[PDB]
Subunit: 316 residues, 2 copies
Amino acid sequence: MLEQPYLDLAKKVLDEGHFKPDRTHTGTYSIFGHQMRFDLSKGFPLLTTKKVPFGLIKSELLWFLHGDTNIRFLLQHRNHIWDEWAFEKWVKSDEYHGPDMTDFGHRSQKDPEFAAVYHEEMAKFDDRVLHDDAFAAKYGDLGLVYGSQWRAWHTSKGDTIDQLGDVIEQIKTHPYSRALIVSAWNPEDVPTMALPPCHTLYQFYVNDGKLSLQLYQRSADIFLGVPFNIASYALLTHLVAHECGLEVGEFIHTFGDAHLYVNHLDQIKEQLSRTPRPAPTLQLNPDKHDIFDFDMKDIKLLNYDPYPAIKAPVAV
Amino acid sequence: MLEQPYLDLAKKVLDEGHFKPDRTHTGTYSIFGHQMRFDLSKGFPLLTTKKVPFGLIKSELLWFLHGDTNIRFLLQHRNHIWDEWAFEKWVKSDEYHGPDMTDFGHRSQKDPEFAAVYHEEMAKFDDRVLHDDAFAAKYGDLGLVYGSQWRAWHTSKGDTIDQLGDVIEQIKTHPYSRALIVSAWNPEDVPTMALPPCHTLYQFYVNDGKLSLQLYQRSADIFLGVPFNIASYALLTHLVAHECGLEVGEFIHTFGDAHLYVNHLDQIKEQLSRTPRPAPTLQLNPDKHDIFDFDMKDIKLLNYDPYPAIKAPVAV
């Protein structure tokens, strides 16, 4: 089936993965150097072996395409993927007036009412970002995120480069270019960044009227992150193809450090006992063509009949 | 044998490669997305199926490690790999006074005495770069090359970042970091660059006391470039390991567009009829440890018994 490369990744990490201590005190089994490809003409690579929130993938990607770096857009779509990063900055601000929250991440998973107080403050934060325009501007703007890196790379002249916009331009005018690359890695920001881009860079490639993309991911969470990561870029591939009047080719996923957290072993094992079902199909708004102006309703997912979702503790 | 991954690449491009027009009017058979790994503990991956100039690989890499961007160093080592780029700038300079030379590249391969005049002027250029310090400074400095990108990345403050120096620092202090990355891709320079970096970025990785490296190459010339490309990075891996007091792991080569030029078909076919021999071994100066201060004599190649060299026309 279409998602086999993923399941094979999970299998391989379990059999050949070597224990490796990471940024957190919850071990990982890891491998270095891996590549898998998905033929987008066969279907959309959204895991059927477990329910994955396509809505979240769609909203986050549109956020990226808009060159947006403010969490407000995500909150307006019931998408809380980046909340922690904004909250992090808010709590450490000289304007924060509430319970400590030092290292909220680690502490939330082990404390009773603390997690309740944390959730309470987070709820306030979200509501504030949503209604106080001044607040959203100061604490809702993450600054250096994919949207900014893809569409507003800061130069030395003080100007900004719309990498993605320029590459799409290059695809239409020079489809046979071997430099259709967009990088999210900036050496001058990386030394002092909470989390340097995981999705380091990607490259488009046109052949026989088909568009393909290769993503180089430096670090990946096999269980929780990868299923989303695959969907995000396979979707990107479709959108860019859609705008450039091309058909979809393949999505090539290359990994640096691919790792599985120990507290996910049982969860990955049970998923491996499920049999994949036919992959879903993706439909895009035929009339709309400027993917940058795309909206939620312009992307439709069809025939997605997955197995129930699998819950697993996050690494913090 | 150790070099099989290379031969398998050549085979695959011949069987599955699709014709693709490139920057030059000499077609190519190409594939997109490929990865091969070499276990450096088994030997040094220098092709035995054809004689490859290790001396050139060694000198060019030391040039890189020194953060050098001036061709003079290369000329002082009988290494002419980058001459064309410097010459290009020289000829187009308001100080050049000699035969036209417009598009010397394309024209040299098809003309009789023109190639002789070209060679004549190039010889003068080299001699000049070698003796006139003022000349070498103006036309010998390529500026934006690997040495500069690796060790003197220009920031917005006007300062420079020694990426490689910092990463080696990170390897010693945080070997388990999943961000040991060095990028050669700068979005603000790329739009106006003669040849944007082919070797886009690389990542180091430590596990069980072994150091490994993955290189993401956006474009590769299967026949002429790859054999050198493999050696350069396998060597880099050894040097960094040598400085960080680690053993060597694997060299992982990932490709974007891997292509074979049509005027190399017969040459690659004949090489595929040769049987690989035992791989050579690499020996490094035991006393020296600051790889940045390394010199030619500090790197020794042993037991390299290759087949004769294969000549093939370059793509220009």
